Design a protein around this motif. Structure first.
Motif, PDB file in Angstrom:
ATOM      1  N   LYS A 209       0.831  -1.216   0.000  1.00 58.96           N
ATOM      2  CA  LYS A 209       0.000   0.000   0.000  1.00 58.96           C
ATOM      3  C   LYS A 209       0.862   1.261   0.000  1.00 58.96           C
ATOM      4  O   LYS A 209       0.865   2.055   0.954  1.00 58.96           O
ATOM      5  CB  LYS A 209      -1.028  -0.028   1.141  1.00 58.96           C
ATOM      6  N   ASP A 210       1.583   1.476  -1.102  1.00 55.75           N
ATOM      7  CA  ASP A 210       2.618   2.529  -1.141  1.00 55.75           C
ATOM      8  C   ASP A 210       2.023   3.934  -1.146  1.00 55.75           C
ATOM      9  O   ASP A 210       2.678   4.892  -0.825  1.00 55.75           O
ATOM     10  CB  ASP A 210       3.524   2.302  -2.361  1.00 55.75           C
ATOM     11  N   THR A 211       0.747   4.049  -1.496  1.00 49.31           N
ATOM     12  CA  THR A 211       0.041   5.318  -1.438  1.00 49.31           C
ATOM     13  C   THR A 211      -0.189   5.802  -0.008  1.00 49.31           C
ATOM     14  O   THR A 211      -0.287   7.018   0.260  1.00 49.31           O
ATOM     15  CB  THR A 211      -1.298   5.203  -2.162  1.00 49.31           C
ATOM     16  N   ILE A 212      -0.297   4.844   0.910  1.00 46.39           N
ATOM     17  CA  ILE A 212      -0.535   5.125   2.334  1.00 46.39           C
ATOM     18  C   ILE A 212       0.774   5.098   3.104  1.00 46.39           C
ATOM     19  O   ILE A 212       1.064   5.987   3.894  1.00 46.39           O
ATOM     20  CB  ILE A 212      -1.587   4.122   2.922  1.00 46.39           C
ATOM     21  N   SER A 213       1.578   4.067   2.861  1.00 46.40           N
ATOM     22  CA  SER A 213       2.881   3.948   3.499  1.00 46.40           C
ATOM     23  C   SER A 213       3.920   4.444   2.487  1.00 46.40           C
ATOM     24  O   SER A 213       4.392   3.681   1.637  1.00 46.40           O
ATOM     25  CB  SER A 213       3.107   2.482   3.839  1.00 46.40           C
ATOM     26  N   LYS A 214       4.231   5.739   2.557  1.00 47.49           N
ATOM     27  CA  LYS A 214       4.947   6.427   1.469  1.00 47.49           C
ATOM     28  C   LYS A 214       6.465   6.313   1.589  1.00 47.49           C
ATOM     29  O   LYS A 214       7.184   6.495   0.610  1.00 47.49           O
ATOM     30  CB  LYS A 214       4.512   7.898   1.372  1.00 47.49           C
ATOM     31  N   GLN A 215       6.976   6.034   2.777  1.00 50.31           N
ATOM     32  CA  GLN A 215       8.430   5.812   2.889  1.00 50.31           C
ATOM     33  C   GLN A 215       8.770   4.340   3.126  1.00 50.31           C
ATOM     34  O   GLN A 215       9.897   3.894   2.882  1.00 50.31           O
ATOM     35  CB  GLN A 215       9.054   6.734   3.943  1.00 50.31           C
ATOM     36  N   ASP A 217       6.351   1.107   2.641  1.00 52.74           N
ATOM     37  CA  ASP A 217       5.839   0.237   1.582  1.00 52.74           C
ATOM     38  C   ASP A 217       6.364   0.699   0.219  1.00 52.74           C
ATOM     39  O   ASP A 217       6.669  -0.121  -0.647  1.00 52.74           O
ATOM     40  CB  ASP A 217       4.303   0.272   1.501  1.00 52.74           C
ATOM     41  N   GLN A 218       6.436   2.012   0.020  1.00 57.34           N
ATOM     42  CA  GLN A 218       6.973   2.546  -1.248  1.00 57.34           C
ATOM     43  C   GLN A 218       8.455   2.201  -1.521  1.00 57.34           C
ATOM     44  O   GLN A 218       8.875   2.128  -2.678  1.00 57.34           O
ATOM     45  CB  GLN A 218       6.699   4.049  -1.416  1.00 57.34           C
TER      46      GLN A 218
END
Ligand SMILES: NC(=O)c1ccc[n+]([C@@H]2O[C@H](COP(=O)([O-])OP(=O)(O)OC[C@H]3O[C@@H](n4cnc5c(N)ncnc54)[C@H](OP(=O)(O)O)[C@@H]3O)[C@@H](O)[C@H]2O)c1
Ligand SMILES: NC(=O)c1ccc[n+]([C@@H]2O[C@H](COP(=O)([O-])OP(=O)(O)OC[C@H]3O[C@@H](n4cnc5c(N)ncnc54)[C@H](OP(=O)(O)O)[C@@H]3O)[C@@H](O)[C@H]2O)c1
Ligand SMILES: [Mg+2]
Ligand SMILES: [Mg+2]
Lengths: 401, 401
Positions: A209-215, A217-218
């Protein structure tokens, strides 16, 4: 004479119903045919309690030493389990400890038989879960902030530089969790997945969920797309396969409609949840293999399911149970095969092939445990209790090893 | 004359394909029949970028003011989206912001039609996902510790007392995440779930990984079992229903074999993932309703799916698409019905019932969008593009409102 081994297997024993099944498997399926050498470590809850979890560490170090381990399912204690067994504390998962010490990716694959259709209509081909074995909430820190307060994460570098970030400030009781992963471990996870895909000639799907976890999950997302671009794009092209990334909710939506036949790379937690979803949909929790592949060259074989606590309670009441030992058998055969491949003892590998084939043939011919009898077509001929199932496998082996 | 409204709906507009569909729905399905009053807030990515996300906050405060909101799907920007739209920063999810300000539980239910069988064989009855709308990683703190270091969580109370816990100490680049939740919010989530179960006369299933997350996930587990014991055990007994708790991997395994017909309570993340799994298995992402029920008395209606980015890209190429507007329509009808129930304007509620019934009747009679045409039995009569689908609904409404 019996089959000989060159290097012992590291054997990690466990708990409840799987502990019951473990010696039946050795005594009936292995020992009559193999002079089984193992280094034995009892990771039963009582032995872990006694040694303050030191035996778990010792077993992990021994797997590093010899290269290949086989692990029985274990209880991870919560407060119910502390009360139940009279424990000193809520010990950390032995899986979490072992997996952290080895590092790697846990490949989980349904064990298929012709007389069980999948729960999910479209699934025609196996889905393999490639579960990152390292970090995230399997090495968490947590605080119950009973008086609330400012809730932060804090990083202090080796030269004393402090970086802080505020989760939330609250004026009421709150709970706090912190987790980590490492760039290097995420990297070995991408590669293990991409290599597995190439070896098996299957697509690789990954999602976070890289949109929510930006550093956080991204970072997984970027590492995978960078490693794929620089190292795998052409290999994949050449093999007729593709890498697919999307958001985690979208990926599971897409998964309900696919024909299967891919590697599904999963962050540690996702891999736990979805390997159960996939095993169940294909057949049962017992009809799945699981192997941790370490980037350091180690291997650990296990069942994907747990101790089957609920069946153990029936066992404790004097009742026969029909718990399916297939996954435990496949952990032994997977580990023994790997050991014989590394050792150059092909007779060991051949027996593993035999036992596996005999397991499938017995179920497909209609003699099976209750989990499979509920879901097979046509209906089973005999619904065998755990020990009866294992005796029938030994008999077919005696009639062949 | 047109149907009148007493109190306006708070309207939150959005992005990409759902933004395209939004005015078609108002213009064709609502405005000819209702003198629609709304307080309009544009949560399109460009308007959020322009206002530094202030418009998101304003829209949330207005929902608090009037009581009922209806929200279009929005882009949550990652780095790809920053590049794509030329954004000042990776803005936080507008869903995460709104949900945090309202608090509550998001109830997600498949919208069923007789001509689509579920992907999962055993599913005969709807599964509702009761998704905790507050906290966890939807309000995270994260650090990319490029030089490693000691990684901690830290809580400072309002009198300066410091509590620390170490996640890990590392000698290499690592990523760090911290999250929180509150005892009170978890409590309102248990109650919302137990109340929903009683109202709908369905069992309630809940699961976490409390064996691994011993202070965090185990707090959810304890809060649910305490609130159930003290407040719901007898009510549940009286209603012929049961509360079931287990570990999260086990629950999804059990779910593949159930007939459905329960409320599945889910922590925020689990609720995101599994509401997509459930919507997809029952039909498509569009065939699901979603309503946030706040413990403070607010309601927010939305689709469970996102912006349908991929379809928007086809739209941008001049292509007609067959994107399913059902979920967006049901958000409007759910919100308008709630508004008319609170306002005492039953004509508004009656129209909502009509539009919903006409939506089902049209699909069941064989006129549908491409997502449903792929999976219906017997085969569709016409595969209608988005605008054609909506025109056919307006026509049936004109022929009845
Ligand atoms: N070491 C591990 O790999 C690991 C993994 C998971 C769980 N655990 C531990 O195991 C304990 C129990 O966890 P759990 O009950 O959630 O999960 P579980 O041991 O995987 O069993 C969950 C349920 O799935 C079915 N099942 C699992 N294995 C089966 C088998 N071999 N044969 C037939 N049915 C099987 C049974 O369903 P029915 O009851 O409907 O028959 C069982 O109750 C906990 O203490 C947990 O910490 C350890
Ligand atoms: N505001 C929200 O509630 C919310 C929720 C989810 C996502 N998002 C945002 O939405 C954007 C895209 O996310 P995503 O592609 O992962 O998810 P998505 O918008 O839910 O769409 C994922 C896929 O599911 C199918 N689908 C979803 N809605 C459909 C509909 N109404 N009609 C027909 N098919 C539909 C399509 O599959 P096919 O491509 O196979 O046709 C679509 O590409 C992102 O920017 C994300 O941040 C917002
Ligand atoms: Mg598991
Ligand atoms: Mg979602």
């Amino acid at each position: 004479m019996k089959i000989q081994m060159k290097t012992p297997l590291v054997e990690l024993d466990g708990d409840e119903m799987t502990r019951v099944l473990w010696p039946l498997i050795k005594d009936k399926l292995l020992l009559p045919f193999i002079d089984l050498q193992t280094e034995y470590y009892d990771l039963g809850i009582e032995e872990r309690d006694r040694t303050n979890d030191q035996i778990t560490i010792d077993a992990a170090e021994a797997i590093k030493k010899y290269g290949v381990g086989v692990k029985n399912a274990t209880i991870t204690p919560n407060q119910d389990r502390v009360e139940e067994y009279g424990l000193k504390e809520q010990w950390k998962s032995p899986n979490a400890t072992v997996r952290a010490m080895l590092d790697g990716t846990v490949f989980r694959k349904p064990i298929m038989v012709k007389n069980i259709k999948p729960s999910v209509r479209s699934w025609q081909k196996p889905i393999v879960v490639g579960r990152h074995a390292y970090g995230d909430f399997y090495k968490n820190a947590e605080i119950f902030a009973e008086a609330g307060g400012k809730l932060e994460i804090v990083v202090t570098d080796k030269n004393g530089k402090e970086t802080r970030q505020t989760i939330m400030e609250v004026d009421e009781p709150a709970i706090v969790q912190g987790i980590h992963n490492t760039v290097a471990s995420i990297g070995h996870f991408a590669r293990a997945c991409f290599e597995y895909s190439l070896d098996q000639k299957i697509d690789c799907w990954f999602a976070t969920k890289d949109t929510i976890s930006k550093q956080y999950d991204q970072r997984f997302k970027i590492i995978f797309e960078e490693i794929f671009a620089q190292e795998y794009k052409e290999k994949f092209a050449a093999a007729g396969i593709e890498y697919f990334y999307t958001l985690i909710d979208d990926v599971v939506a897409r998964m309900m409609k696919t024909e299967g036949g891919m590697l599904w790379a999963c962050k540690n937690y996702d891999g736990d949840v979805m390997s159960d979803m996939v095993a169940s949909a294909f057949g049962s929790l017992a009809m799945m293999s699981s192997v941790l592949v370490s980037p350091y060259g180690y291997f650990e074989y296990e069942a994907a399911h747990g101790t089957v606590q609920r069946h153990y309670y029936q066992h404790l009441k004097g009742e026969r149970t029909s718990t399916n030992p297939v996954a435990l058998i496949y952990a032994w055969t997977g580990a023994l095969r790997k050991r014989g491949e590394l050792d150059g003892t092909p007779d060991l590998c051949a027996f593993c092939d035999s036992l596996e084939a005999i397991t499938i043939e017995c179920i497909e011919s209609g003699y099976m445990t209750g989990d499979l009898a509920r879901i097979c077509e046509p209906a089973a001929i005999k619904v065998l209790d755990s020990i009866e199932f294992i005796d029938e496998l030994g008999k077919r082996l005696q009639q062949l090893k």
